Amino acid sequence: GTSAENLTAAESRIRDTDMAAEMMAFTKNNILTQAAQSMLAQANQQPQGVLQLLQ
Amino acid sequence: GTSAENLTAAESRIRDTDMAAEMMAFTKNNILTQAAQSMLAQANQQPQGVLQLLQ
Numbered sequence: 001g002t003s004a005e006n007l008t009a010a011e012s013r014i015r016d017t018d019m020a021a022e023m024m025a026f027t028k029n030n031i032l033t034q035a036a037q038s039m040l041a042q043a044n045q046q047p048q049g050v051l052q053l054l055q
Numbered sequence: 056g057t058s059a060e061n062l063t064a065a066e067s068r069i070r071d072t073d074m075a076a077e078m079m080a081f082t083k084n085n086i087l088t089q090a091a092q093s094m095l096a097q098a099n100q101q102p103q104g105v106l107q108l109l110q
Contacts, residue, residue: 052078
């Protein structure tokens with residue numbers, strides 16, 4: 001029983017994930033995704049030099 | 056992806072044209088065309104010495 005509990009703890013620490021750290025990373029990546037979305041929406045509007053030609 | 060973006064930038068700078076410079080050149084050439092048109096209209100009228108002969 002003692003050995004099984006100790007090895008279970010070891011295997012948990014090796015393979016299982018901490019919820020808090022992954023939550024942090026996921027929120028960070030979502031915020032970065034939104035930022036890149038807005039930046040791309042701006043960059044698509046940036047090349048508008050049609051007022052050179054017409055008037 | 057990085058290499059493709061860099062080579063795309065290079066190819067764009069080589070082959071694609073800047074709209075502003077060509078707009079400048081086109082406006083310049085149109086103005087010169089109009090000037091030459093007026094000059095030719097004048098030069099065609101310049102040789103009128105018929106008042107030597109008749110009266």
